Amino acid sequence: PNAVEQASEAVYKLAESGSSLGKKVAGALQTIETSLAQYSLTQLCVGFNGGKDCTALLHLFHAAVQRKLPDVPNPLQILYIRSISPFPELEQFLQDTIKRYNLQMLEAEGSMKQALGELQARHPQLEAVLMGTRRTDPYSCSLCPFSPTDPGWPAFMRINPLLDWTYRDIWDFLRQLFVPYCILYDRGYTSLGS
Numbered sequence: 433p434n435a436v437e438q439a440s441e442a443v444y445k446l447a448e449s450g451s452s453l454g455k456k457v458a459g460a461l462q463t464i465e466t467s468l469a470q471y472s473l474t475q476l477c478v479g480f481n482g483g484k485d486c487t488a489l490l491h492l493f494h495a496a497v498q499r500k501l502p503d504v505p506n507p508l509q510i511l512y513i514r515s516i517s518p519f520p521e522l523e524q525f526l527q528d529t530i531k532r533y534n535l536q537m538l539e540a541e542g543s544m545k546q547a548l549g550e551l552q553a554r555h556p557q558l559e560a561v562l563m564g565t566r567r568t569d570p571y572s573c574s575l576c577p578f579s580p581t582d583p584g585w586p587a588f589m590r591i592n593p594l595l596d597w598t599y600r601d602i603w604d605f606l607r608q609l610f611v612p613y614c615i616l617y618d619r620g621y622t623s624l625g626s
């Protein structure tokens with residue numbers, strides 16, 4: 433077996449386990465399942481930058497899709513904004529992830545706002561972006577699970593299933609489900625945030 437093939441079973445077994453982490457996973461999965469009722473798989477993507485937060489999120493998204501929409505032929509979409517020179521270990525992880533989950537990647541380059549705008553013009557049906565955001569400052573503590581982008585931003589629905597997860601929660605989840613993550617976290621990196 434592999435983690436991707438086994439996601440739907442193992443992820444929902446954890447969510448049904450009653451552990452502290454199980455309750456976090458169940459909460460995330462409820463947000464994602466709600467997302468799947470609101471948005472088609474052409475309308476929905478995961479904001480993916482190779483970090484541990486969106487790695488956990490992608491695994492949750494795949495697991496929910498396998499459970500609620502196994503016959504839908506559409507592939508899972510990720511959105512990646514390239515805002516910095518290539519970092520070889522991170523690029524390899526992105527390519528590896530694309531292969532593992534058979535992803536359709538929507539990519540643009542430049543600043544977040546300009547690149548999101550370009551991506552919107554190229555993919556006008558895209559409505560919603562699953563985000564790995566956690567509650568780490570006053571702004572993120574103010575977010576709802578479904579939070580439209582702020583004024584002055586390309587208009588998307590941000591969906592935030594991990595708001596209540598801790599740093600420890602993210603690592604416990606990835607380790608307990610044997611989910612591959614970017615090798616940079618083994619080489620002294622604590623965050624890949626901007």
Ligand SMILES: Cc1cc2nc3c(=O)[nH]c(=O)nc-3n(C[C@H](O)[C@H](O)[C@H](O)COP(=O)(O)OP(=O)(O)OC[C@H]3O[C@@H](n4cnc5c(N)ncnc54)[C@H](O)[C@@H]3O)c2cc1C
Pocket residue numbers: 478479480481483485486511512513514515544548561562563564565566580581582583585588590624625626
């Ligand atoms: C689609 C989208 C809409 C946004 N809308 C707003 C907004 O309305 N108001 C505002 O103040 N900020 C907005 N942001 C900015 C966002 O909140 C972060 O400040 C920014 O993405 C940098 O994230 P970080 O990795 O530094 O940290 P974090 O805030 O921890 O990142 C949160 C999540 O953003 C996603 N993400 C981050 N970097 C990328 C990337 N390069 N490509 C794709 N997804 C990425 C991932 O899902 C990540 O888990 C938006 C970002 C995205 C991608």
